[PDB]
Amino acid sequence: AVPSVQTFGKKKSATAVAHVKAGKGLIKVNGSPITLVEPEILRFKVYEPLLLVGLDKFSNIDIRVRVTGGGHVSQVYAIRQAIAKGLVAYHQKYVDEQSKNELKKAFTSYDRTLLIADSRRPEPK
Amino acid sequence: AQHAVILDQEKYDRILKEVPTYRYVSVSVLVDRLKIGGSLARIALRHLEKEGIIKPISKHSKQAIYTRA
């Protein structure tokens, strides 16, 4: 039908699912614009995957995400991971491995956690 | 001794002339160096800031930060 992908992110129990499709640069979380993410201090923590690559990259795609459980902080890390993984997944299919690795270079230069979960888990006792 | 809790006319004059002398002002700054209670300082800042005598640089309920400008 239309070029589209789904990707997910994790943190602890929060589970963010993201969809990407061709369209017009918009980013919504639970239907709200991402500029309203809360608390305020952690908002810039979500701008990271935008500023670190550059806003031009997003102009042709629609991002919407739903975050489900977890807690107020852990859910924030889930969505930023879901965004970054979603972005490379789209490029991998609809442009080239050149741009794909260019994206991966930028992300992993700043923070490995943008692509891979830390696998920490509670003590079994 | 106890800080003042109602604004005498003499202190009002004192406030307006002296406050532009200070690089940095805050609720604590007023209450420390002028003998007024904190319940005055919160009101006085809103007054002087709207009067334009001091320049806000950040505001956050529990903290507020005003400067000579």
């Binding site: 239907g31 614009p33 309203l36 | -």
Partner: protein, 141 residues
């Protein structure tokens, strides 16, 4: 287009509650200024004159975002921690008598209506009204 989802939560509430007080149709129980709103609270609401309208606006927004609600769920939402003196704290629900009258008052002016599957749902006129306030709130910036 604009939706209520597009506006900051407390910013929208302050705008709409102030407007709703001017309309004057929202009718007060009259026992207002005695009730604590929760058995866990100490001292009544401090904004003695305005607090009823501000709560009324909050309820409308919350229902707008959801399929339907009832009185029991609202009592949970607005609950809090009760000190229990020397004992550890515990969760306690807020007053029911307040919230039930708020629903009935909002229904009188047609924002909200009783729904099948129980509880209340937003009216199409509720949608039409709340969207208009949202547009003003953005443009008033």
């Amino acid at each position: 287009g604009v939706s209520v989802r597009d506006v900051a939560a407390q910013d929208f509430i302050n705008a709409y509650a102030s407007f709703l007080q001017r309309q004057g149709k929202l009718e007060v129980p009259g026992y207002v200024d005695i009730v604590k709103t929760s058995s866990g609270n100490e001292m009544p609401p401090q904004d003695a004159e305005g607090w009823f309208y501000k709560r009324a606006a909050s309820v409308a927004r919350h229902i707008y975002m959801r399929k339907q609600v009832g009185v029991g769920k609202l009592n949970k939402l607005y609950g809090g921690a009760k000190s229990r003196g020397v004992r550890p704290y515990k969760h306690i629900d807020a007053s029911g008598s307040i919230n039930r009258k708020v629903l009935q008052a909002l229904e009188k002016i047609g924002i909200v209506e009783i729904s099948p599957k129980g509880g209340r749902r937003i009216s199409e006129n509720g949608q039409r009204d709340l969207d208009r306030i949202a547009a003003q709130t953005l443009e008033e910036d």
